[model samples]
Target chain A: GQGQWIAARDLSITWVDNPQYWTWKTVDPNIEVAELRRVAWLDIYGKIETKNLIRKTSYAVYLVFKLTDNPRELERATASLRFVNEVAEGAGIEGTTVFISKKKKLPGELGRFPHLRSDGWLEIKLGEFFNNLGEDGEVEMRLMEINDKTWKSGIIVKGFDIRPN
Target chain B: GQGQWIAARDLSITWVDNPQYWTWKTVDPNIEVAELRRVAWLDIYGKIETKNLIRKTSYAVYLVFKLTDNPRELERATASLRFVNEVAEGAGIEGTTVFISKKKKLPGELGRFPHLRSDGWLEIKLGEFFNNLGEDGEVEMRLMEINDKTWKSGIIVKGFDIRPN
Candidate 1:
């Protein structure tokens, strides 16, 4: 259960009517991030079964992304996640609100590690938890915000990763 | 350490696993009032250390209670707390969606504050912090929610009280 990688095309994404909001682009070939556009209310997340994780220990998941192009777009940006749960069918089971404002530059605290990729994007810690023993089921990892009615654009998401701490 | 209170407890609670909810009985022969009862979910909070607070200044903490029972049992009736940290715990943490709607068969808000104690349960600011000075320590204030499938039970705890302002 180490270094499991997911791409935007492989994730469950709910975007507004516009197709441009979730565009896909190649990152010099083998690597690519989901280019999330728009500030309108939106939700983007991935899922995994508890059986696919390291149990009796804690884990931290992150949305490996970069908002460098439009830093101001994320000033009031926030995120949230439902703890590994039993029932998460819609709205991804409301968890807590996550304020994604660790740092406002090229490097950020959006992921477990706040360093940059060799190619330059960034990541932030999307959620953290202690996967209790004997727990197995489909749980959702989410991202959403309707804090404002304005359209928020410029942040690119390189999918997400669930890692053990 | 005597009567220091937290307003969070003053708010109505709905535990998930408990059956009797919170029942009241005259403690010795000298206590009573604030008649209230429940259906689901639970909340209990207390107050604390000034230097131990998260703010650099003072702020107000309300008993923010609404006894009107059964109105959807606090659907989206949210909860949150500012944990002690350089950064917030998570979007400052808002958990357990509670819906404010209840019927007052007892004194109604789920208790028997039938009459005020020797001290007014009305001024229940619960916890206030001076954050004014350098005095700091481990504070016991809290806000917790059990928004899950499991059931929780306990007799209604008396209105929690903290003596300081």
Candidate 2:
């Protein structure tokens, strides 16, 4: 399913990236990517409407990203994405507390299949949740590399996927 | 979008449809209906896996039902459908406080377009929820007439519809 597509050009928010940091040379056709490098803070995130999802069902949001060739020092990043339910820019609820990364995943985490793609790419399952009603709001998903010691880099983020697990 | 279908005859929990009361009638070929007659209990409900729904896509759960002639009494019944997140019978969460009927309708409810099609069946928007991942369990949908003095008759239970909203 052609879920919501997030281009590298669109991924900008608490993270800094120069023109070279954004790449249009991705495996997917016309797909752009945000080159991840050693930065003090590596935050990849996006927001979407809860109503856009099928009501009363289980949907998993995925980061259709890939690790670059030079992933030597990139092992320090935390293996989880923070999902927040928001109403506006500065107002919302703390969503998914922890969604472990497939690379060096944490123990007791739900599930993780962040590996290579059959068509050559990478899709990591961040986590899953049950979208309830009455609380129609925006889901702000964040994949941050802000651990105790941060200089995380070497990742190419393509887009996000809010698909049925 | 084509959604998973749950047969009406298959949903007979808490609902009493004696072989005499509920008849197998086919107005449209291949579409069998459970012609529901008057009874003391007019409660219709069912349970299903949320995973069956397209994850993260906007979809609605509709009661593909039809009211018998003289719908004045039917108007007294509320159209709010209770969605329960549970594992087994008698084990779940009290999902909602109130989701009023679109027939008369309550204000501020996510959106309701309960009307009839040319085919002659009434498709009422019961309620809406987001399809999230991880919390993929069972969702118990319910539609009952539990008013102080609820009607106990006059509805033909055909089937259910979980399609794109």
Candidate 3:
């Protein structure tokens, strides 16, 4: 005999920033300023089913970001990103990033934008940004500046969240 | 101990149109459009280190394009570029692309011949588009593309050159 089990979870957002420039206080006082320019949250889900003798399930999430001109933030953010991936090992998670300086531009009557002329300045890849938080959980975050130009920065954040299986 | 190895081989180039664009023309009057893009020449060079490790070596060359408005041409061109990595079979060597969009104007920017606004609009990636090379010393080349509305139109290839290390 087999029964069905289903569970759902929500990722809530909280913000913390200065009200003079941008304020997250109206939404959530805990929200923090994103260390990178482009931040994308990937939600992963998996299901486990048993057939008499076997059970299988898999899940993963990736946080994709495009680096910025702020070298300090970039350096601090990359360090943190790498640390998170290292700590998430064996949880079936990983992270990675690639930085490029030029890109390709396609052509045509609509040839306004050519794929041949693009460039990749920098990339920060994280395989598994976070994972495996069993009940009581604590997460730490840190940032480091790599250069004085304000564009080379790194970041690391480690924490556990309640599983949404 | 050290070892030296050398071999004589035949290398050449031919052009082929993508099956999608079957009607594309060839610059060479005697060659079929598809056959024209094949392989004009293959240049191979690598190092033989101590203990025959072949530590850090590579073989590469350019695939010249001599056609216009041909989607098949683009596919073939990209395939040639990707062949370099494909041959390595996920070895240490990696491939990537930089996407450059055509020039365009932003809402507030007043500069003439303005460049494409790259904020979240431009992108670059790696990976081959075709896996049709049936095992004949595949050359892996990086593929870069700019995915902007203004870039959908076909672009021209001035030329591409390959190198070894």
Candidate 4:
């Protein structure tokens, strides 16, 4: 089918509102979400535009959140998908520790955790590219963890998708 | 003064004796200590040489460990020192999130945590180098966490040191 999303006010978080961390809200009329409240550096991001995708295919990228019940270190956080010019070249590709929360058991073949979705929220993937046809540009999706300052807080965000894998 | 320590059977532990994880023992007759019994991937290494060290000095590289009151993800593991040919060139210097356990408070300027010594044990550092005078040879020193398979266990390694910072 098709996909695309990228809402959370267009993504690129990192201190979203900084009212001591982040809060935002909204959810309808145009979406919005953010939430956090205690960060120690998390950084979100999104970007799309591979010429409207769907050339050869393979897209992927996910992240869409919502935790709220004691969430600290949302379980590792790394994610990445690159291609905004590979961010200055070479040695790219090493992000992807991912977790986003919800683990009681899982990690046998390691799936990068988070799943829930059907609308309750929680997506987790943040990777995969390949749109080909002669390179269309743009594609960045990240998720960051900021070197483990380790303070973290609940989640929320609600954005980023891309799909088509 | 002086400093060397690389004991724990000379360090390079990976499965150590792998009796399912590790166990070793002793503390006298040349010392021992490994003890893990649960690992999900932890590794530990040590090397040092730089022609007897001391040329321009700077050294650093710690590690030494011990926990066991309950230790899971020994904080964050990672540590590094490099120069065994810089491991294969360029992009080096990334390791160093260290903790080795013992952190209920200590991350405001981040000294990398761990510290307890004075004869008890528990070091940390794992980074620093610079022997100069025409570069001698080895210098490795690692520590590792192995991409968070995250099972871990008590700890208690007892090795790696390198002095002169």
**Best candidate per DockQ, number?**
1
- State how far residue B31 of model 1 sits from its true place (Å): 18
Sort the candidates on lDDT, descending order.
4, 2, 1, 3
| Candidate 1 C-alpha RMSD relative to the actual structure | 12.2
TM-score of each: 0.52, 0.43, 0.21, 0.29
Q: Per-residue CA lDDT of candidate 1, range A25-132, in tens?
A: 677567766666664665677877666666564555677777654543455444454434322123235444444534534332332224465657666666554455
Compared with the true structure, what per-residue lDDT tens digits does model 4 show for residues B27-72? 7556778889788888888786677765654556787778888888
Instruction: List candidate 4 segments past 4 Å from native.
Output: A1-11, A14-30, A33-77, A80-96, A99-108, A117-119, A125-165, B1-31, B34-96, B99-111, B117-119, B123-156, B159-165
Output the better candidate (2/3) by TM-score. Answer: 2
Indicate the docking level reached by candidate 4.
Answer: incorrect
Tell me the DockQ of each model, to 2 decimals. Answer: 0.07, 0.03, 0.02, 0.02
lDDT of 3 by residue, A1-165 (tens): 122222111112122132222222111234232332222221222222223211121111222223334423331121112222112112222111222221223221110111121222122221111222221122222222223344322211111121111
Q: Which stretches of candidate 3 lie over 4 Å from their true place?
A: A1-165, B1-24, B29-63, B66-95, B99-139, B142-165
Models sorted by DockQ, best on top: 1, 2, 4, 3
Q: Is the docking of candidate 1 incorrect, acceptable, medium or high quality?
A: incorrect
Q: TM-score of predicted model 1?
A: 0.52
**Overall lDDT per candidate, in order of appearance:** 0.47, 0.53, 0.23, 0.69
Ten residues in a row with the worst lDDT in model 4 chain B? Answer: B85-94
Clash pairs, candidate 4, are: none
